[PDB]
């Protein structure tokens, strides 16, 4: 009745197509983000190799710029478009104001794009939610989340995608100032959280870190194996 | 049956029913008649007075679309006023380009084509107005034209539009307009309008008349009130 | 509405009992009943091949062309098979009632959209109501058998010269046996169909509206 | 398993040949035969007083065996085979049309709709003809019940009239049944002949090869 | 169904039923037009029906002049007919402007017909519910007769009719061409009038019909006067 | 269902069914036959007229796009003319750019691109016509078909229109690659002779040939001479 | 009721059903195959058109060359395929004009996939009902095989098949393909094997398949279509090997 | 289907006879029936003012307060009215069948569009079927009168103490007279409505799909 | 949380249903079609003149102004009934099996990709229709005995009325015709079941179809 067009409000004022896009996000692979004191760690599950596929082509985590990166859960093609648009906006902002982009600026831009696609019929919402991580000029860690609706919110730590409810409950339990004390502890926290919802530990998680003034580093599979081994042993 | 919803559509039996539905619009209107005689063309309208509050000389259905032509309308007054603006624009453009007053046949053809544009496209409805146009020029002579919502245009020695079209047409038919002169034709127009007016259904009317002819030196104008009063008294007397 | 603590306790008790009983039924009772009815139809009595084995004597004195009828028993085979079947049909009707109530209590607040989950709930409700009507039909025909056979034997005794009533009594018994084996087959099929549909759509049944949204509001 | 398809295809080929022969010869011939029976003098009688059959029941101031109307019985005896035949042919063509229904597919549902319409008229004809078959059966029971009521109550006058009126009504119904069976044969032939292309070949042999 | 009610969508049999309805719209008018070609002349005749006495008989006409040497007769909706006539006049004048010579009758028909095609392919607008028949003299080919229809078919003809009695009229004309001996101007006009009068049963008077002609001697399209029409009519009755 | 009416809607099972309906519109069109001989290619179609009143010279179903290319159609006559004008224009654009006659393969690619261009937009309908585009380029014959879908195929010989399946079977029975066009025209008229349901005459058919000389429509006298056999 | 229309409405449970219906279309298409080897990469396809009266005038019906350094094979609607290949060639030549270097394979695939995503998102146009495999050599990552779908989503595959019986092709390739051990000859033999398995015809005709190989020779990529004699030899060798394997048992 | 020459002749003669009979019924028989029903309505017997006049004499002995039944005849008036009306009823049913099959034969081949003609045909045959079912209901009531009066008379004779059964018998006769008069009126109305519908929509009925 | 026993039990039931469906579809249907064709060829079903199957009724005709002996049922029609009745019950059983097999093949309810589900419901309504017709045939078989017994009892009680005797003979005739029609439509029903299931088998067994590329 009222779920076929984005423009039409429902009785009780629910816009339902954007809700359906938010539901589409839930289908996607899990992603998790956590703010350490000097690190921001972004972890994403890997669906499966399929044994005849090249892993390099598929990468959920991406770097918008030197100081900002994102991970997504939702439609992969839409994510690719949004990533490219945010990258060109990053370089354009540097061009315009001779300064590097702030994490809140880029998440605002991505949210504005998603909002622009929601408002008008003849265009469908981007079926993605994103986890944007970066370090600002002051050096404070920043974690933001975006959704198809176009609202953005800072999170100390969060998850998106399938099993987001379970892993975020686990993270609400586990997260504390103590865990954020160590960079290795932050990485281990996100690894344990993804382990809460994933078939196998090392094979099916792709993880990355950003340090205070370093570029994004996708942790090697051997490093992830070492960290899960340390996590597994402690239990 | 979804054939009648749009004017782009055709009925399976070859009928565009939206246009006919728009033709039914004018029949809601109060009657209006125009008669052509040797000297010129006389127009008359039965303007029903909906309320005492409304000012006299308001809701005018007789428009001047150029100095030498006048327009009388039946159907939706909004569409009619818009069509009058279109006709005035066409006449002004004709004067500006070709350097002289527009021939009535050509003006009728252009406004009729503008009307006919709307019957084709789905986005926009047909006009809800049927209107008569009349002019006198020493070269062309007296000319009376009527345009339906379809965009059909024809020349009428006498014409009627609106609710009482058929009765008005027989009354006009028994007139011999060709020999007659305008100052008599105003009286007979008043007679016909008073006849066709239904006192029971329609509470009251104020006769609105105009003419164009040699007596005006070829300018359409509203009737002088003395002549209006004379014609109205004659119509009331003849009504019995 | 204002509720006492005792009222809330009573309602929550009914709710938790219904949920746990539905879980127990579909996970445990349904497989057990499926195999029980399966072995029962595999039983030799239900698979009688020669129907003249089923027909039982009616001691109506045939009228010689020109004294009284002794006690005319019911068909032992058919009544024993009926004694087996009747618990099963009544049990299935009870369990379908339980499933209906479980799904209905799981129906959420009425809402403008996200009604696909409640649509699934309505579809499975349509199916369970259909099997409910079917088992009610079974329950009435089992009584129709007794009433019809009694009327038939009464007619045969009253009009001895008519043999068509005697043939009718035998035919009622045979048709009853056929109906009973089809019945146990249908009961097993209904248990299995309930299991399949509920197990397949349990996620939307238990949680129709779904997980909480990001709350753009 | 291809052997099952082979046997079923043999059955469907037999059905196609039988249905084609049915339309070609049997339906026209039966239309001719049934109009011939219609125009026969027996079916159209000027006065139903002649149709009236005697009731030997006594009249008040144990009855002799009352008899069926021989007129009605002979007319029914010739009618009933026609009803059975038309029902059989209708079942044949109905089964044939059902077998010709193609695999369900999203596109080109025209041709399936043609079969659906023809199937609808076949269903209607089936209903009416089964009603005729029921009517023939109930006539005898009604007449018997009426004469038994008359015997139980000799004084009641209108039970005699009920018996006579049942006979007359059955006569008129018989001629109407003959008319309707004729028209059923004709309309079935007409519809199937007109729509035969789509009925036999709903989807059509054409393949676009957009792929 | 729903396969009608939009021109764009094709039927499952690929027929585009809407244009076929536009063809019916021509017959809805209740008038007929006939065109027949001759060795040195081409003529167009059509019924002229005045519903009311008050109507000026001069104004009502289905015969229009696209250019000095081409004439047309329109059958169908009066408004669509007038619009197509205006488009034809514009096309003819634009052809003269661009290419320096008078448009051929065949090319005029082709232009109008392909316009009708763009109508029958685009969604929002509807095919004009009218039929055109063009007559002119081409120096190379002699007389010509052509017809546009709402679909975009523009074929040329020896003789044709349009309107309600089209099938009867073309049956009549088909017999006459089959017994082909010739057609001079008088016989051409007589054939046209006899066809129309026979199919309608009208037994016309001069007011009821309007005729237009082109001739190699006088190439300009002219609409004959009531006196000329009566002259032809009386000749028909006498023989 | 809704898939039937829309042109930008894939049906379940992934069919653009309006295009299939346009192909059905093509199938209703009159028979047309194309046979690629070694030294030429013949295009033939029936030009059956409703009445004697029709003037055959007025319109032609076989049209030249260029000196060395010509084509024939089965389907909607107006759509045929829209695309024949567009094809002539495309060929002239090629000649302006490259100052060489356009290759037949390139022309069929371009007109098929046009036909595809029409299918995408909802406001328009597909062209309810298919074409057989024949040409002689680089001392080689060519025959192509272009469907309403916007797809094109290269046929040694093929038929469109009514009874196209039966005509294609007759052709594959009768077709030999070694055929000269003198024989191929005979085979083509026979292929049409399968499907007329009338007594063919010089007027009732239109046929054209391509060769090293170029495309031409052989006259009524020529087709009478060939029909005499 | 119906949330499958207009390609711009997320259905409940958040699925775009028009693109899924388009993905259904490619399954009908003729099977296409691509295998990656250490020395080269090949494309093999089944010429579904097997009408007797068809001419093989073109370079290939399914295989297209997009650039000096890459090629593609297409499964899906042929008209949309033609459009996509034209767009691909223009994209590659635009990159060559701008940077005066050959287009990277992944970049070209990504650009066309961006187009295909765009057609999904905006209302009027339908999604492209096409899936096509890309093969190319680039200096950065060497030989590469890529697959794309109507959704606009692409991936890198060592070996994959699209079209009819793609699942059977992938199942056969999974067991047979040796990672890091293939050569172009062995990959050709594997291609013949999986094509024979998938294709309904008992004997691969050698006119019912088209095989093309991409190799780097003398510092320049060469894209070659194996001629009918070469593929005839290949099917003869496969038949002999399979029969000998049969003969032993 | 292969059509034999004799089969083609048979189908052609059926179609010819049906169309001829349809024209004859519409233009010659139908107005004659309308005038016949008019004069029958004008007859005095069918416009009896006082229904108590046709109250029949029911002679059954009043029981003496605290012997045998003679022959009880039926009401001659209502029996005569039945004798008049019943032929007209069955005649209308027959002609309805004729019109139905005539329309069905005029229905054309199924095609996707230009279906407004077949829609008109379906509407007309729907009305004709409605007329037929009302006519069949009249036949049912005519049959019911005899059985109901017999039941009532038998009940009154069996139970002479209860006078309400005698009152019921008289009521049955009165209701029968009213129903029969209404039958004549609505038979005329049905004939006229059939003429009106068919004559008004004849062009589309005979030629639904345009030309 | 299924037990291992529970999962094994439902698994064996599903597999047995599938095997029984395949066996019925590909073996039982052809065999029954040819067997019912043989029955139709048999002379008993092909009796031409129904006066032959008329059975004598020995109720004493009353003299114009004592107890009827054992009056037998008609041997021919009761034997034909003995032939046809097992086949009717068998068809009802097999159609129930087909219904169960289809219902187990019905997938999880999801929006979109519902054409396979629609095919499943369409074939399901067809098999339900034949179920209705065969149970109706069973009811006719059952009612024949009761109605003929009432008819013959009435004829005996009222010897004067011969309409009841004619009714007994007419009931026998109608029963024979109905039995022949029953056998014919049983053959037709088996063939129609095979046709619909075989034609739409791919969607019936796999409604949603092959797993997609998974845009997610």
Curated annotation (Swiss-Prot), chain A:
Modified residues (N6-acetyllysine): 226
Keyword match Nucleus: yes
Residues with Phosphotyrosine modification: 152
Gene3D superfamilies the record matches: Glutamine Phosphoribosylpyrophosphate, subunit 1, domain 1
Entry keyword set: Acetylation, Cytoplasm, Glycoprotein, Host-virus interaction, Nucleus, Phosphoprotein, Proteasome
GO biological process, one term: proteasome-mediated ubiquitin-dependent protein catabolic process
GO cellular-component term (any): nucleoplasm
Domain of life: Eukaryota
UniProt subcellular location: Cytoplasm; Nucleus
Effect listed in the UniProt record for changing residue 111 to D: Found in patient with severe intellectual disability; uncertain significance
Induction trigger: Down-regulated by the ribozyme Rz3'X. Up-regulated in colorectal cancer tissues.
Residues glycosylated per entry: 129
Gene Ontology terms for molecular function: identical protein binding
Modifications made to the protein after synthesis: Phosphorylation by ABL1 or ABL2 leads to an inhibition of proteasomal activity and cell cycle transition blocks.
Pfam families the UniProt entry points to: Proteasome, Proteasome_A_N
PROSITE patterns with a match to the protein in the record: PROTEASOME_ALPHA_1, PROTEASOME_ALPHA_2
Family listed: Belongs to the peptidase T1A family.
NCBIfam families: PRK03996.1 (NF003075)
Record's protein name: Proteasome subunit alpha type-7
Organism for this UniProt entry: Homo sapiens
UniProtKB/Swiss-Prot annotation, chain D:
Pfam families membership: PA28_C (PF02252), PA28_N (PF02251)
GO MF, one example: endopeptidase activator activity
One Gene Ontology biological process: regulation of G1/S transition of mitotic cell cycle
Disulfide bridges in this chain: none
Assembly description: Heterodimer of PSME1 and PSME2, which forms a hexameric ring. PSME1 can form homoheptamers.
Record family assignment: Belongs to the PA28 family.
Protein name in UniProt: Proteasome activator complex subunit 1
Gene: PSME1
Swiss-Prot record, chain F:
Family: Belongs to the peptidase T1A family.
Phosphotyrosine found at: 3, 21, 73, 118
Gene3D superfamilies hit by this protein: Glutamine Phosphoribosylpyrophosphate, subunit 1, domain 1
Subcellular location field: Cytoplasm; Nucleus
Protein name: Proteasome subunit alpha type-2
SMART domains associated with the record: Proteasome_A_N
Modified residues (N6-acetyllysine): 67, 168
Signal peptide start-end: none
Main location: cytoplasm
Disulfide bonds: none
Inducing or repressing factors: Down-regulated by antioxidants BO-653 and probucol. Down-regulated in response to enterovirus 71 (EV71) infection (at protein level).
Key words, A-Z: Acetylation, Cytoplasm, Nucleus, Phosphoprotein, Proteasome
Function: Component of the 20S core proteasome complex involved in the proteolytic degradation of most intracellular proteins. This complex plays numerous essential roles within the cell by associating with different regulatory particles. Associated with two 19S regulatory particles, forms the 26S proteasome and thus participates in the ATP-dependent degradation of ubiquitinated proteins.
InterPro entries, per the entry: Ntn_hydrolases_N, Proteasome_alpha, Proteasome_alpha-type, Proteasome_asu_N, Proteasome_sua/b
Domain of life: Eukaryota
Mod. after translation: Phosphorylated on tyrosine residues; which may be important for nuclear import.
GO terms for cellular component: cytoplasm; cytosol; extracellular exosome; extracellular region; ficolin-1-rich granule lumen; nucleoplasm; nucleus; P-body
Residues carrying Phosphoserine: 4, 11, 13
Any one Gene Ontology BP term: response to virus
Family matches, as Pfam families: Proteasome (PF00227), Proteasome_A_N (PF10584)
SUPFAM superfamilies: N-terminal nucleophile aminohydrolases (Ntn hydrolases)
UniProtKB/Swiss-Prot annotation, chain H:
Keywords: Acetylation, Phosphoprotein, Proteasome
One cellular component term from this protein's GO annotations in UniProt: membrane
Biological process (GO), any one: regulation of proteasomal protein catabolic process
SUPFAM superfamilies xrefs: Proteasome activator (SSF47216)
Pfam families on file: PA28_C, PA28_N
Entry's induction text: By IFNG/IFN-gamma.
Record flagged with keyword Acetylation: yes
Alphabetical list of InterPro entries matching this protein: PA28_C, PA28_C_sf, PA28_N_sf, Proteasome_activ_PA28, Proteasome_activ_PA28_N, Proteasome_activ_sf
Modified sites of kind Phosphoserine: 4
GO molecular function ontology, one term from the record: endopeptidase activator activity
Similarity comment: Belongs to the PA28 family.
Assembly with partners or alone: Heterodimer of PSME1 and PSME2, which forms a hexameric ring.
Function: Implicated in immunoproteasome assembly and required for efficient antigen processing. The PA28 activator complex enhances the generation of class I binding peptides by altering the cleavage pattern of the proteasome.
PANTHER family, per the entry: PROTEASOME ACTIVATOR COMPLEX SUBUNIT 2 (PTHR10660:SF6), PROTEASOME REGULATOR PA28 (PTHR10660)
Protein name as catalogued: Proteasome activator complex subunit 2
Biological source species: Homo sapiens
């Amino acid at each position: 009745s009222y779920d076929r067009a984005i423009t039409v409000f429902s009785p009780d004022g629910h816009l339902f197509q954007v809700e359906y896009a938010q539901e589409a996000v839930k289908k996607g692979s899990t992603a998790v983000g956590v703010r350490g004191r000097d690190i921001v760690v972004l972890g994403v599950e890997k669906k499966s190799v399929a044994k005849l596929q090249d892993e390099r082509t598929v990468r959920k985590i991406c770097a918008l710029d030197d100081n900002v990166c994102m991970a997504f859960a939702g439609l992969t093609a839409d994510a690719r478009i949004v990533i490219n648009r945010a990258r060109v906006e990053c370089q354009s902002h540097r061009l315009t104001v001779e300064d590097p982009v702030t994490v809140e600026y880029i998440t605002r831009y991505i949210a504005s794009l998603k909002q622009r696609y929601t408002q008008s019929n003849g265009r469908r919402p981007f079926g993605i939610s994103a986890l944007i991580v970066g370090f600002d000029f002051d050096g404070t860690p920043r974690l933001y989340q975006t959704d198809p609706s176009g609202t953005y919110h800072a999170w100390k730590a969060n998850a998106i995608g399938r099993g987001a409810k379970s892993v975020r409950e686990f993270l609400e339990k586990n997260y504390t100032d103590e865990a954020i004390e160590t960079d290795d502890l932050t990485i281990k926290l996100v690894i344990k959280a993804l382990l809460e919802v994933v078939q196998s530990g090392g094979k099916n998680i792709e993880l990355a870190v950003m340090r205070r003034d370093q570029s994004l580093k996708i942790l090697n599979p051997e490093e992830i194996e070492k960290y899960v081994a340390e996590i597994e042993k402690e239990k | 049956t979804g054939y009648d919803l749009s004017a782009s559509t055709f009925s399976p039996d070859g009928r565009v029913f939206q246009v006919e539905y728009a033709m039914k619009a004018v029949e809601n209107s109060s009657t209006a008649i125009g008669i052509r005689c040797k000297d010129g063309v006389v127009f008359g309208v039965e303007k029903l007075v909906l309320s005492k509050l409304y000012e006299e000389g308001s809701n005018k259905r007789l428009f001047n679309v150029d100095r030498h032509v006048g327009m009388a309308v039946a159907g939706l007054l909004a569409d009619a006023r818009s069509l009058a603006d279109i006709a005035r624009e066409e006449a002004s453009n004709f004067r500006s380009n070709f350097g002289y007053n527009i021939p009535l046949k050509h003006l009728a053809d252009r406004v009729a084509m503008y009307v006919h544009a709307y019957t084709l496209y789905s986005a926009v409805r047909p006009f809800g107005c049927s209107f008569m146009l009349g002019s006198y020029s020493v070269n062309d002579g007296a000319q009376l034209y009527m345009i339906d919502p379809s965009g059909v245009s024809y020349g009428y020695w006498g014409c009627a539009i609106g609710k009482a079209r058929q009765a008005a047409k027989t009354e006009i038919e028994k007139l011999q307009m060709k020999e007659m002169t305008c100052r008599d034709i105003v009286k007979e127009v008043a007679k016909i309008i008073y006849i066709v007016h239904d006192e029971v259904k329609d509470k009251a009317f104020e006769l609105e008349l105009s003419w164009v002819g040699e007596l005006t030196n070829g300018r359409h104008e509203i009737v002088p009130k003395d002549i209006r009063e004379e014609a109205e008294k004659y119509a009331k007397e003849s009504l019995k | 509405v204002r509720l006492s603590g005792e009222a809330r306790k009573q309602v929550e008790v009914f709710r938790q009992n219904l949920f746990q009983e539905a879980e127990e039924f579909l996970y445990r009772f349904l497989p057990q009943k499926i195999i029980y009815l399966n072995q029962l139809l595999q039983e030799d009595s239900l698979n009688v091949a020669d129907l003249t084995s089923l027909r039982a004597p009616l001691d109506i004195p045939i009228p010689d062309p020109p004294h009284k009828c002794g006690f005319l028993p019911g068909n032992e085979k058919v009544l024993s098979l009926l004694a087996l079947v009747k618990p099963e049909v009544w049990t299935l009707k009870e369990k379908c009632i339980l499933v209906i109530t479980w799904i209905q209590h799981l129906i959420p607040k009425i809402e403008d959209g996200n009604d696909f989950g409640v649509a699934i709930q309505e579809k499975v409700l349509e199916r369970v109501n259909a099997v409910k009507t079917k088992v009610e039909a079974f329950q009435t025909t089992i009584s129709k058998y007794f009433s019809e056979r009694g009327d038939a034997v009464a007619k045969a005794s009253k009009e001895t010269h008519v043999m068509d009533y005697r043939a009718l009594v035998h035919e009622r018994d045979e048709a009853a046996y056929g109906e009973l084996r089809a019945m146990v087959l249908d009961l097993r099929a209904f248990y299995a169909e309930l299991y399949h549909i509920i197990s397949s759509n349990l996620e939307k049944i238990v949680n129709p509206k779904g997980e909480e949204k990001p709350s753009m509001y | 398993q291809p052997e099952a398809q082979a046997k079923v295809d043999v059955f469907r080929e037999d059905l196609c040949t039988k249905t084609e022969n049915l339309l070609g010869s049997y339906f026209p011939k039966k239309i001719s035969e049934l109009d011939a029976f219609l125009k026969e003098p027996a079916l159209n009688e000027a006065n139903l007083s002649n149709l009236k059959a005697p009731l030997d029941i006594p009249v008040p101031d144990p009855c002799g065996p009352v008899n069926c109307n021989e007129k009605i019985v002979v007319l029914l005896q010739r009618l009933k085979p026609e009803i059975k035949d038309v029902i059989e042919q209708l079942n044949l063509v109905t089964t044939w049309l059902q077998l010709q229904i193609p695999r369900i597919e999203d596109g080109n549902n025209f041709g399936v709709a043609v079969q659906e319409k023809v199937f609808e008229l076949m269903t209607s004809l089936h209903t009416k003809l089964e009603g005729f078959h029921t009517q023939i059966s109930k006539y005898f029971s009604e007449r018997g019940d009426a004469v038994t009521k008359a015997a139980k109550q000799p004084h009641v006058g209108d039970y005699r009239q009920l018996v006579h009126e049942l006979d007359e009504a059955e006569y008129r119904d018989i001629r109407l049944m003959v008319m309707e069976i004729r028209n059923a044969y004709a309309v079935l032939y007409d519809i199937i002949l007109k729509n035969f292309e789509k009925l036999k070949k709903p989807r059509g042999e054409t393949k676009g090869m957009i792929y | 169904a729903g396969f009608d009610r939009h021109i764009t969508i094709f039927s499952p049999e690929g027929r585009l039923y809407q244009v076929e309805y536009a063809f019916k719209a021509i017959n809805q008018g209740g008038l007929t037009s006939v065109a027949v070609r001759g060795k040195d002349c081409a003529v167009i005749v059509t019924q002229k029906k005045v519903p009311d006495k008050l109507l000026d008989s001069s104004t009502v006409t289905h015969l229009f002049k696209i250019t000095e040497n081409i004439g047309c007769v329109m059958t169908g909706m009066t408004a669509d007919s007038r619009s197509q006539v205006q488009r034809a006049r514009y096309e003819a004048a634009n052809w003269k402007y661009k290419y320096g010579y008078e448009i051929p009758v065949d090319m005029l028909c082709k232009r109008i017909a392909d316009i009708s095609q763009v109508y029958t392919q685009n969604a929002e607008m509807r095919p004009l519910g009218c039929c055109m028949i063009l007559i002119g003299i081409d120096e190379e080919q002699g007389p010509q007769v052509y017809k546009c229809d709402p679909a975009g078919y523009y074929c040329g003809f020896k003789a044709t009719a349009a309107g309600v009695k089209q099938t009867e009229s073309t049956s009549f004309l088909e017999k006459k061409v089959k017994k082909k001996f010739d057609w001079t101007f008088e016989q051409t006009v007589e054939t046209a009038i006899t066809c129309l009068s026979t199919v309608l049963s009208i037994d016309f008077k001069p007011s009821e019909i309007e005729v237009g002609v082109v001739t190699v001697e006088n190439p300009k399209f002219r609409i004959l006067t009531e006196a000329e029409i009566d002259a032809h009519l009386v000749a028909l009755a006498e023989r | 269902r809704g898939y039937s009416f829309s042109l930008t809607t894939f049906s379940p099972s992934g069919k653009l069914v309006q295009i299939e309906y346009a192909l059905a519109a093509v199938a209703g069109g009159a028979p047309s036959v194309g046979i690629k001989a070694a030294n030429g290619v013949v295009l033939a179609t029936e030009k059956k007229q409703k009445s004697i009143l029709y003037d055959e010279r007025s319109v032609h179903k076989v049209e030249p796009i260029t000196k060395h290319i010509g084509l024939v159609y089965s389907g909607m006559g107006p759509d045929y003319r829209v695309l024949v004008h567009r094809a002539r224009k495309l060929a002239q654009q090629y000649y302006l750019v490259y100052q060489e006659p356009i290759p037949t393969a390139q022309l069929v690619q371009r007109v098929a691109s046009v036909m595809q261009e029409y299918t995408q937009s909802g406001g328009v309908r597909p062209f309810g016509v298919s074409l057989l585009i024949c040409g002689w380029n680089e001392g080689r014959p060519y025959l192509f078909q272009s469907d309403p879908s916007g797809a094109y195929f290269a046929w040694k010989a093929t038929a469109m229109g009514k009874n196209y399946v039966n005509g294609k079977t007759f052709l594959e029975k009768r077709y030999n690659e070694d055929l000269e066009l003198e024989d191929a025209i005979h085979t083509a008229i026979l292929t049409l002779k399968e499907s007329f349901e009338g007594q063919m005459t010089e007027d009732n058919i239109e046929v054209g040939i391509c060769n090293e000389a170029g495309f031409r429509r052989l006259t009524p006298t020529e087709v009478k001479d060939y029909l005499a056999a | 009721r119906r949330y499958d229309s207009r390609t711009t409405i997320f259905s409940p449970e958040g699925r775009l059903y028009q693109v899924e219906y388009a993905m259904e279309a490619i399954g009908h298409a003729g099977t296409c195959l691509g295998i990656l080897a250490n020395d080269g990469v090949l494309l093999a396809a089944e010429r579904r058109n097997i009408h007797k009266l068809l001419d093989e005038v073109f370079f290939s019906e399914k295989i297209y060359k997009l650039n000096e350094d890459m090629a593609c094979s297409v499964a899906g609607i042929t008209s949309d395929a033609n459009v996509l290949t034209n767009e691909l060639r223009l994209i590659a030549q635009r990159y060559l004009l701008q940077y005066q270097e050959p287009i990277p394979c992944e970049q070209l695939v990504t650009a066309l996939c961006d187009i295909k995503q765009a057609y999904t998102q905006f209302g009027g146009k339908r999604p492209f009902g096409v899936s096509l495999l890309y093969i190319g050599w680039d200096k950065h990552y060497g030989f590469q095989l890529y697959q794309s779908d109507p959704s606009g989503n692409y991936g890198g595959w060592k070996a994959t098949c699209i079209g009819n019986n793609s699942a059977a092709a992938v199942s056969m390739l999974k067991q047979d393909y040796k990672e890091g051990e293939m050569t172009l000859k062995s990959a050709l033999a594997l291609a013949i094997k999986v094509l024979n398995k998938t294709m309904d015809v008992s004997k691969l005709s050698a006119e019912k398949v088209e095989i093309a190989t991409l190799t780097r020779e003398n510092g320049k990529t060469v894209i070659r279509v194996l001629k009918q004699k070469e593929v005839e030899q290949l099917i003869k060798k496969h038949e002999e090997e399979e029969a000998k394997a049969e003969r032993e048992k």
